[PDB]
Design a protein around this ligand. Structure first.
Ligand SMILES: Cc1cc(C#N)cc(C)c1Oc1nc(Nc2ccc(C#N)cc2)nc(N)c1Br
Lengths: 427, 552
């Protein structure tokens, strides 16, 4: 009942103006997808065509979700978000369930659909301007602007929150043990139930939303068993700590102890438990690398004490909502990729290792871009928000492919990094 | 005539009003020049004589451009253009000829007074107010206001295009085959219908525009192949660049050299082989607009060879959505690479080069991928797809490379091209140490102040050496030392440093570097049969290097 015609006065933050981000160019494949997608949207009246009194423009890509047929237009409202929604991380913000990271299972459902009902502030519409490009500019971009809550723009959830709470009301009644956290376009439903039990609580809700006003595609695809894995289920309860493990050997050469010395040294901004002064000196002479050095020591009481202190998780690390999370990833080989989420250098909040294959059909990008997605999700569960990536790939290369295997409706923020040298020895 | 087109609404930047710049009286020869003109405009509805309180004014100059009888009025909008809201910018993107499909026959029109035929947001005319001087008497507030896209304003270009686009639309629908390209004042129209039919459709579109008030100053089509467009010459199976005349002075200043790289890079779209690293290298911190800069043997030679490549023409062909897109790369030098993309052999669509940014050191495999990437991004723009890459690198050199390389990467499938010089790994480091091979504990330091330093080694066999170094860096020495080692070692060796810095510069396994010293090492590495590099704690944890740190 906002005085304005169902428009919830939306407003960019003070002394801030609309987004003017460039549209990267896409393959003809995608241009075609996007024009088919948008021509409909125009007809369903979700978007309308704009003119030249609109300097504004946010990017847009075409991706393929859980499916492998129909395409999907994914707008990159990152800039528009930073420019509005912070004045909407407050006003109409949505709190975060500390237990969700706790529950046994968590399933994510995509409700980005509801939005297209609720009309957008007629005054703000102008900022959702996106352009569909031409090949070789042999014509000017097709220009459209939203009239409804666009999906992707952190405005929608916020604005729409009311309507949600309401819908979910019944379900939260019957089932009161189950948590439901929304984040942008997804619902994160978690339970203590057993496998198929949980998958029933979900499917009920699924049917609940579905019978009461809103479409709801993915948790999964179908009942057809082909022995796949793209069905999206989650389990906060296990994912935990890190393999900051030292090697277990039989014939220790110098090179072998020499390293052990600096790997254990490295952990001197982390675990206090060791300074290998004693183990270091066990090689003051200038012996040979290939050579062999024995076990009796004044110093081994260290590989002793240390081999265990490195197993007790360090405390003194505290999340901080004000600060931005920063995730790093190292390519480790054999389709293996480690990672750490921190806020303040060497005070790691979470450190894991997404792996896929070793040499199948997968490839370096795809995995990276898959590990990201993983980490991003884990992140949204734990602290209810996406981190900022320092990705080990060349800017231009990522910009050409990430679209490819990309699946989520959100885009984290990223930057590209150097040759972490010995930092690669984290696993 | 004028136009029934809807107007695009405009407005001034939030909290800003119209310009109020007064007129600088002048030659009554011009005050009489303008008056004539303005009358011919108002009689055409373009301009509109206004009243008293239209505060706004914008200077109107009148220049009878040299060697021409008529005069052309000129209004200076700078002020309004600062008060006008920003627009969706006029496609800055220019298509690349290599991406233009075909069309047996093309016509180019010339929507000139075009902008003067498109309506101007009513409520926005006020600010177009301008005045022409009263000969000093009767105080003429001879005031005229614009009712169209003033040939100078900010939103003029964009709004024209929009307005034009909306226009074509109808015509476009009755001839889904005729493709038309609009840009500035041109309108390129092309058909697959013999000159007979085709001309019908041009004459046709012609009047169509005219009913929209758009008058095309061409009884026939003033088209004159080749087309002199955006620095290119357009032909019926060939496209190339316009005359690229490369200067030759006894003295070159920064802006001299710049304009040169420019003409070079542009020429590189089709003149295979154009190099430019050395030249541009000259322009460094070269923020001295006019400061003579002596060329280098390097620069002159490149410049030379460039003159050599230019002396004989080269055409580029158009495009076939039907055939394939293939791009090949070949190495031509100092970390310089050149390429060309084609659908059929010995003709090209376009060509191009590639060198590394001021980035410390590189490597052949890394660099070639870097080229492939550039070609890929470019191909998606021009053609909207990725070409088939034929590359001079054995697939095993690249896997052993990408695989062990610490950084993500994905190059579509290519195809080996025996045409040497091949791209190979000049060497590899033993991942695992070397038994029997001597072990050198290498080191080098310098007083961060006195600018002095020394490099030297210590071995398992008891051999040692220290070499004096002056004017160096705690850095150039850490490498110095590694290098000293590789020098005295034998066919096989195990070096060990306290420099993650040095460690990592070699670790990357470069083959080319700006740093002569590294190149120095890169040399030696070649010779070694087996080389193993290791990094113990730089300082503190003082293991075996505990003894090279002191006497170095
Ligand atoms: C002629 C032209 C120029 C510019 C711009 N700028 C832009 C476009 C979209 C054009 O149409 C096309 N012209 C040609 N070749 C061509 C044919 C004849 C002549 C002549 N005479 C010149 C070029 N091939 C196409 N696929 C297209 Br589409």
């Amino acid at each position: 009942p906002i005085s304005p015609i169902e428009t919830v006065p939306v407003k960019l933050k003070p002394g801030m103006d609309g987004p003017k981000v460039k549209q990267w160019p896409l393959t003809e494949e995608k241009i075609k997808a996007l024009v088919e997608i948008c021509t409909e949207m125009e007809k369903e009246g979700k978007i309308s065509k704009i003119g030249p009194e609109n300097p504004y423009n946010t990017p847009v890509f075409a991706i393929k979700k859980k499916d492998s047929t129909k395409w999907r237009k994914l707008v990159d409202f990152r800039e528009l978000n930073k420019r509005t929604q912070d004045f909407w991380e407050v006003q109409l913000g949505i709190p975060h369930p500390a237990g969700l990271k706790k529950n046994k299972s968590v399933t994510v459902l995509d409700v980005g659909d509801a939005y297209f009902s609720v009309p957008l502030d007629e005054d703000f519409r102008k900022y959702t301007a996106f352009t569909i490009p031409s090949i070789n500019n042999e014509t000017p971009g097709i220009r459209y602007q939203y009239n409804v809550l666009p999906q992707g723009w952190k405005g929608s959830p916020a604005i729409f929150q009311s309507s949600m709470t309401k819908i979910l009301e019944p379900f939260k009644k019957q089932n009161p043990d189950i948590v439901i956290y929304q984040y942008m376009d997804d619902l994160y439903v978690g339970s203590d139930l057993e496998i198929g039990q949980h998958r029933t609580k979900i499917e009920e809700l699924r049917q609940h939303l579905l019978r009461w006003g809103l479409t709801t595609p993915d948790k999964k695809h179908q009942k057809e068993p082909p022995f796949l894995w793209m069905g999206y289920e989650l389990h906060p309860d296990k994912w935990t700590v890190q393999p900051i493990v030292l090697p277990e050997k039989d014939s220790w050469t110098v090179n072998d102890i020499q390293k052990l010395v600096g790997k254990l040294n490295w952990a001197s901004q982390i675990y206090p438990g060791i300074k290998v002064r004693q183990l270091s000196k066990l090689l003051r002479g200038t012996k040979a690398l290939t050579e062999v050095i024995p076990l009796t020591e004044e110093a081994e009481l260290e590989l002793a004490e240390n081999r265990e202190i490195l197993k007790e998780p360090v405390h003194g690390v505290y999340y901080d909502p004000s600060k931005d999370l920063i995730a790093e990833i190292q390519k480790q080989g054999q389709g293996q990729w480690t990672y750490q989420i921190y806020q303040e250098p060497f005070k790691n909040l979470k450190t894991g290792k997404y792996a896929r294959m070793r040499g199948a059909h997968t490839n370096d990008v795809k995995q990276l871009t898959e590990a990201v997605q993983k980490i991003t999700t884990e992140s949204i569960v734990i602290w209810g928000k996406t981190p900022k990536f320092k990705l080990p790939i060349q800017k231009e290369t990522w910009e050409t492919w990430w679209t490819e295997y990309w699946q989520a409706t959100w885009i984290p923020e990223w930057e590209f990094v150097n040759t972490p040298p010995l930092v690669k020895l984290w696993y | 005539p004028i136009s029934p087109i809807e107007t695009v609404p405009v407005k001034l930047k939030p909290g800003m009003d119209g310009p109020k710049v007064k007129q600088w009286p002048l030659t009554e020869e011009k005050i009489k020049a303008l008056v004539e003109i303005c009358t011919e405009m108002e009689k055409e509805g373009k301009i509109s004589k206004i009243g008293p309180e239209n505060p706004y004014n914008t200077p109107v100059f009148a220049i009878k451009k040299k060697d021409s009888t008529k005069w052309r009025k000129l209004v200076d909008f700078r002020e309004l253009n600062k008060r006008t809201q920003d627009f969706w910018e006029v496609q800055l993107g220019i298509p690349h000829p290599a991406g233009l499909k075909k069309n047996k026959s093309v016509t180019v029109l010339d929507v000139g007074d075009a902008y003067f035929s498109v309506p101007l947001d009513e409520d926005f005319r006020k600010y177009t107010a301008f005045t022409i001087p009263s000969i000093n008497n009767e105080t003429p507030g001879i005031r005229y206001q614009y009712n169209v896209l003033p040939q100078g304003w900010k939103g003029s270009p964009a709004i024209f295009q929009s307005s034009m686009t909306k226009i074509l639309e109808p015509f476009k629908k009755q001839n889904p085959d005729i493709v038309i390209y609009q840009y500035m004042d041109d309108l390129y129209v092309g058909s697959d219908l013999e000159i007979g039919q085709h001309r019908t459709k041009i004459e046709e579109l012609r009047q169509h525009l005219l009913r929209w008030g758009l008058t095309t100053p061409d009884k026939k089509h003033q088209k004159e192949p080749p087309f002199l467009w955006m620095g290119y010459e357009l032909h019926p199976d060939k496209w190339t660049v316009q005359p690229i005349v490369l200067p030759e002075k006894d003295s070159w200043t920064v802006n001299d050299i710049q304009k040169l790289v420019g003409k070079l890079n542009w020429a590189s779209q089709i003149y295979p082989g154009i190099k430019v690293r050395q030249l541009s290298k000259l322009l460094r911190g070269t923020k001295a607009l006019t400061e003579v800069i002596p060329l280098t043997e390097e620069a002159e030679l490149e410049l030379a060879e460039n003159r050599e490549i230019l002396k004989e023409p080269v055409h580029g062909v158009y495009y076939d959505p039907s055939k394939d897109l293939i791009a090949e790369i070949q190495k031509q030098g100092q970390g310089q690479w050149t390429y060309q993309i084609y659908q059929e052999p010995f003709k090209n669509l376009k060509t191009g080069k590639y060198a590394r940014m001021r980035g410390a050191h590189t490597n052949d495999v890394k660099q070639l991928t870097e080229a492939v990437q550039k070609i890929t991004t470019e191909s998606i723009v021009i053609w909207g797809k990725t070409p088939k890459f034929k590359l001079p690198i054995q697939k095993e050199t690249w896997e052993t490379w990408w695989t062990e390389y610490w950084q993500a990467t994905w190059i579509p499938e290519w195809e080996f091209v025996n045409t040497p010089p091949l791209v190979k790994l000049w060497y590899q480091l033993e991942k695992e140490p070397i038994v029997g091979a001597e072990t050198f504990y290498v080191d080098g330091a310098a007083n961060r102040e006195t600018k002095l330093g020394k490099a030297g080694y210590v071995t398992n066999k008891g051999r040692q050496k220290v070499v004096p170094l002056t004017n160096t860096t705690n850095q150039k020495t850490e490498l110095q030392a590694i290098y000293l080692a590789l020098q005295d070692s034998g066919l096989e060796v195990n070096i060990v440093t306290d420099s993650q810095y040095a460690l990592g510069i070699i670790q990357a396994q470069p083959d080319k570097s700006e740093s002569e010293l590294v190149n120095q090492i890169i040399e030696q590495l070649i010779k070694k049969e087996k080389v193993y590099l290791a990094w113990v704690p730089a300082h503190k944890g003082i293991g075996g290097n505990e003894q090279v740190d002191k006497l170095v």
